[PDB]
Subunit: 473 residues, 4 copies
């Protein structure tokens, strides 16, 4: 039972729009919209979306496996050993948001202050005292961006597992001598950095030059979550404001995916005429290149919607029905729709490129879609006993014979393993992750699916608990 299965079970259900059924529905956590900063919806005038893993949630683990197979094939085709072809993606290992250390070849799970919480070299999890040789302060300098790559998105889920497989394969293959910073193959040296780069380059190649998009479109029911409540919610959004799409995908792919997402024998509700997906949007912008999009951006261009290619030159005209933009910046959207930042609720999945940057660079309101949260919420309500036992041991230990500290590390471990081999997305025991930090800080609203917005009336006031400093209480 994967997180994408819960989303597709809830998607197969028709919208009960009775005012009482909505209140009762959003009482359950799997359908709630969770609040980090107060937000009054009657001040929202423009609703903004990205596509990949927001409108178009790719089914798990089929989509991560397809990415893993295709990336592995690319690496073999440029000269990596045939033993990669015998790997096989294991959705139980990787958790989203890990840091790969290109110096020593480890996956690290860190809190916001760069403290180590989990460290795995290949498939070998390194315990507290043994990490101190490489991490003398149990700490990483997050600013050292040449050394530490954060794997933020669900596209990074294959490479997260792939990076372990590779370290594990070379570590234990006798053709290679393991060194501190990589692998000697006789007279060739492959550093963990250059290996990381080869993986990284390959994933890029698979998305942009390879067969990933091709193979997704040819079996969309295997790969993309489809929900007939999506036309309904967007149509209700356009009744009270403007709806725009700002995606990093190209128009050809966006068209195929959106068409599928809207292919029903009806419009917003059952029994209405089916409309084309573009008619649900006041502004459709592709090739967004976020997060540069929220700074100076790129030259603004016009898509030839018949051929799918860009017209030649910079677009200088007005917003007209059925025009489609490529590139540009976030200001392009604000000028054309005549909106200020806090007018906009931008709905996205990239904690950094979608959410943080729009918040910090433009003052946009942010809604972060967290697909894994549909499963994680279940695990959390079925093991509330282990976390509650953890909160109790933390409290008793404070009142204090350190045989307690070893029962804490054990309960920690068992709680963590329920989510995966790399723990929960948001914490390792009582200690929160960098991801969790960035959600709380930069995401006003968050949820397992944005479709949860449908169960809230369009005047609602999302409330957040006021923050008080220590001395202020």
């Amino acid at each position: 039972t994967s997180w994408s299965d819960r989303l597709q079970n809830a998607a197969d259900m028709p919208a009960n729009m009775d005012k009482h059924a909505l209140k009762k529905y959003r009482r359950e956590a799997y359908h709630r919209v969770f609040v980090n900063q107060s937000l009054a919806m009657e001040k929202i005038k423009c609703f903004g979306f990205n596509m990949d893993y927001t409108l178009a949630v790719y089914k798990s683990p089929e989509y991560e496996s397809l990415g893993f197979e295709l990336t592995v094939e690319r690496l073999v085709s440029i000269g990596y050993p045939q033993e990669l072809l015998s790997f096989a993606y294991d959705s139980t290992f990787p958790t989203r948001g890990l840091v790969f250390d290109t110096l020593y070849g480890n996956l690290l799970k860190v809190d916001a202050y760069g403290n180590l919480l989990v460290c795995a070299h290949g498939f070998n999890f390194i315990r507290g005292p043994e990490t101190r040789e490489q991490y003398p302060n149990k700490f990483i300098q997050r600013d050292d961006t040449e050394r530490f790559y954060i794997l933020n998105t669900l596209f990074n889920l294959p490479e997260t597992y792939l990076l372990a497989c590779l370290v594990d394969f070379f570590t234990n293959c006798p053709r290679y001598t393991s060194c501190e910073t990589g692998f000697k193959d006789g007279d060739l040296f492959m550093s963990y950095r250059s290996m990381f780069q080869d993986v990284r380059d390959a994933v890029d190649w698979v998305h942009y030059k390879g067969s990933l998009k091709e193979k997704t479109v040819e079996n969309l029911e295997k790969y993309v979550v489809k929900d007939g409540k999506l036309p309904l919610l967007l149509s209700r959004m356009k009744e009270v404001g403007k709806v725009f799409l700002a995606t990093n995908s190209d128009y050809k792919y966006t068209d195929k995916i959106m068409t599928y997402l809207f292919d029903f024998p009806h419009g917003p509700k059952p029994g209405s005429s089916h409309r084309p997906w573009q008619s649900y949007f006041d502004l459709i912008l592709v090739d967004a290149r976020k997060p540069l999009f929220f700074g100076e951006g790129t030259v603004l261009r016009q898509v030839d919607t018949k051929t799918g290619k860009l017209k030649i030159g910079t677009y200088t005209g007005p917003l007209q029905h059925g025009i489609v933009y490529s590139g540009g910046s976030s200001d392009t959207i604000c000028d054309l729709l005549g909106a200020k930042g806090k007018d906009i609720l931008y709905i996205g999945d990239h904690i950094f490129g979608d959410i943080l940057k729009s918040k910090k660079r433009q003052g946009w309101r942010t809604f972060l879609v967290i697909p894994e949260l549909a499963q994680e919420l279940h695990v959390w309500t079925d093991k509330s006993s282990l976390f509650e036992e953890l909160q109790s041991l933390d409290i008793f230990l404070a009142e204090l014979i350190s045989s307690i500290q070893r029962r804490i590390k054990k309960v920690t471990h068992d709680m963590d393993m329920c989510y995966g081999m790399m723990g929960s997305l948001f914490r390792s025991g009582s200690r929160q992750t960098l991801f969790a930090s960035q959600v709380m800080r930069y995401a006003d609203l968050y949820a397992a699916s944005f479709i949860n917005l449908l169960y809230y009336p369009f005047s609602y006031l999302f409330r957040a608990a006021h923050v008080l400093m220590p001395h202020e209480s």
Copy 2:
């Protein structure tokens, strides 16, 4: 009654070291050490200090006025109008941590997300709807560092008031035509940016080339808080670990100030032999150049303690008794004292250069000294009624005829004016400031004076409330 008066009233009292008197004393808030992240003191092996506004708290407003007089004189001496000589520092206007906007010449008080909370052009406070011409989203891009300067330190207190005086003087002096971005003087244009720079340059000149240090030393009782509990606390720190000084001042000035700070007819306790201040330190490092200090730093040099000048060349020797260092980096301290980051409790006043950078760059534990907090704590406990009335109106308004929203803005204003014309350091009404945000995030411990550490036993476990995400509860 200034914040520096409370600190000097509490400094004139001898240390009652009875185990019960200490518990009872730190029950009052003016003597508490406030906790943002749990910290176990038995893991602290090195105690680190900066000098200015930590060990050497300059008395207010005498020190801010001396800085204001000296800066004003410098500006007149390089060609500014004689009317500056008739200004006079007003400690009731400036609050620490404001942002000066060099484009439009305003002082802004902002939250962590760059939202405007107060905007004053000169001495004219601009209300909500009128700021929207210049701040269409009520927002500033904090990343635009050419436009927005944060006034972080209490040395910035004179310039904070001086910048208003100048905008107010030119705005209302008929020799000058006020423009959007500065002042026309016939055929000369002075932009708010170049004016800001002239002020900025002048303050620097006063500290490094002018008479500020000279005039401080010649009347230390007028200017520096002195406390006989300081020798005691440092001597107790050296009983359980190592004590180092990392200050940005030069050795000559550090020597004069520290000598004064330790001039008593006794040592740590009454009746003991007086020791020189240097003997309270395992490592004394001047000319620190923070925050670059926490990165690559500067070349490490040796001070000639007799002449006060640097020896020629880079120091390459070991730590010996009575050696004094200039420059270097934070690694210089860790190697020589043989300490890891989380071993160190660095005590400082610069939220950015002392606290943030050591936390984020090196994993150091941080203690932030907030001198204003001695007065602010009083104002807060004597007007708890207005804040509690504010929390109530915020709650009732949520249950909701918007005549409530105007009683909120009025109570906000009256609460704020109790702290100054620019509000409290930590909030404007229910909304917290960027400073408050950075304290909670990067300062493990904070207090009005570090001497509050003396009232805690050296095994204490400072505890912080665990943070839970919305869905986690």
Copy 3:
């Protein structure tokens, strides 16, 4: 009669190696090696080559036309108008070494001090007084590299003509409104900069992703000059030193071209066994990435000569027979062959990336191959009368009724048109070009073909006239 026809007439002749026949042969200018700085060949220990337009001179204009056809097709395939397909490369317009001004869309021919010598907008040559609107000082800032691109190589010959065709087509096509900095197509704007970029990008794409290499290999006799004196000269070079190849091409293409260049029924001389081309080289390095090659370079890699792909990782081994390198730096060559800079004679065609950078960055001796010089030499000896008449008018005008200055500009024009519509490579009348300047400065030796080195004994002392300052004479 193109420059590549003279080279192939002289290539079809067998080497007369009689000591007297060589002296007499190199008396004619078409076979001379021309000297800019004295060079003693007995001090040369390593001979270095690049491939494209040095070892492998592509026949003209067939190769420039193939590049022009392929580039034009690419531009139409990404959305440029169908009228490009009716263009047709005209080898009489472009001269090598022009500057394209991306601001105003002109091809300029400039001297070393950035003085305009010819300015053509499209196919319209702009006269002296009319250029002063756009070029008020008849001058360009060569340091402004965003504005001015120098077309240095014979690969730039198609784009040189293509850039005119495009300006001429849009200028005179009524669908487009000509502006100062580009072309309005209703609501799209194509600046001369973005147009230049589109051309530039296309040429790159044709070489690296398109069909240019493919179509060259399938008809090498149409495209590549072949000479049986090349095996002989290289074999004589290896008798007195070391020979290395440092080319920017990949191994697959290098192999196909070199194989052809050496496909004869014999070795160095007629009647000897044929050897493979690799055996003429002590070190074979591909993927050179010059001119970065002469700085820090790139990671050094090893080619799998069977598959043609790079092995995985950085090469760390020694120079062994039959190893082939990819990337690296110029130091890689010096260490492995144990040579100092002035030991090396590097033979190349890129005045900047081959010649200047090796001279200025590493002290290498330089030999520049100038293919056009085979035809240019002819034009020069058949019109020596017009240049001599120009030198006379320049002298008489100095003795001086400015009806002389108009006979000078007329003789200038007629002399120039003999070389092309864009004049000679080295001068426009009495005034030398930037190219000519850079040859004299950075090329020790130069010639129409490096094969001219065969007619000099391997002890020869190339002599250059000593330079005297004005006051020194």
Copy 4:
């Protein structure tokens, strides 16, 4: 007999303005204007000057000794050993234009291609074979600007000698251990780089904060060459165009020096009323900050000529009589005087900041003043026998028993020593220096004094020999 003595002998003579006396006078080389690029004076509309070592030639060696004494004193005052006070400037060692290598502490004399011509470590001149340990190719990468500083100006004459003295003192003082890259003083290390910096910083301090300007003004007849032909030439320049001053000095110092330069009991000719120096100028600009001046420059300011301080703000007004500018750019001059680049003859002494940059960045015509050339010209005409003997041996050696090559190196050495211990400014034997290269390339006209322009009629056509490539002849 120093170069400044010849200039002051020729300055003490009144101008014979008879048309025949001028022709005959400029037949001698000490009064000629030497030509590198043809220049027609009737096209010159604006004459531009810098002050230091152009208008105000500081007498030698008194001014270099005053700089050497003052710099040495500064270094002792910041902690350098007392033995410096016993140094004493020796005008026979340093030649202008040397390169100091901050890695190995050597003064190098190099040609344009970075070839070593002389290498002295301290006062020890290193011969050919011994430099190959540190300079394996007898070559330096001129682009490595962190390692190699060019000493371009006559202000660099003291530091040139001072750098040798220091290397020589530490090398042979037994308190210090000489290392490859500097000097160990027990536990302090002084690298040649940091030593170079200390010298460099000190020279700056002496000019800007020290007593050099003060002590020059108090004895101008000891320090500044004065000539009554200077008012005459400038007055003749203003009869046929515009005259502007663009100097890097401040207004106070410029005023004192210019006043002296013009203090005579008469105006341009004897018997005319004396005018103030400012009246000889259409535009007077101080604080020029060249060579940035020829790029984006600095903010343009206005000098208060009464107080000598800058007014506050950016100047925005027109050119009016008696206004004086500070900062700005070269465009400021062209706009205000309404001149194109090739209208301007800029007269200066900085081969790089005055001459090269104006030529390459703005197309300005350049006149380089070379004070040493007054003596050097004498040495050259009195030893023409040794150079002519050198040209003969170079020719005979080409016809060739290498006992010739050792007579060449000996004649080279004896010719060189006539100019100084560091050879002539322009060559070492038959090989020209980088300086000589940059003069020929970027200086249209050059001379020992610009006053030599007075002996040429204001219509003159300076002619230069046309350059022909090898194959073109």
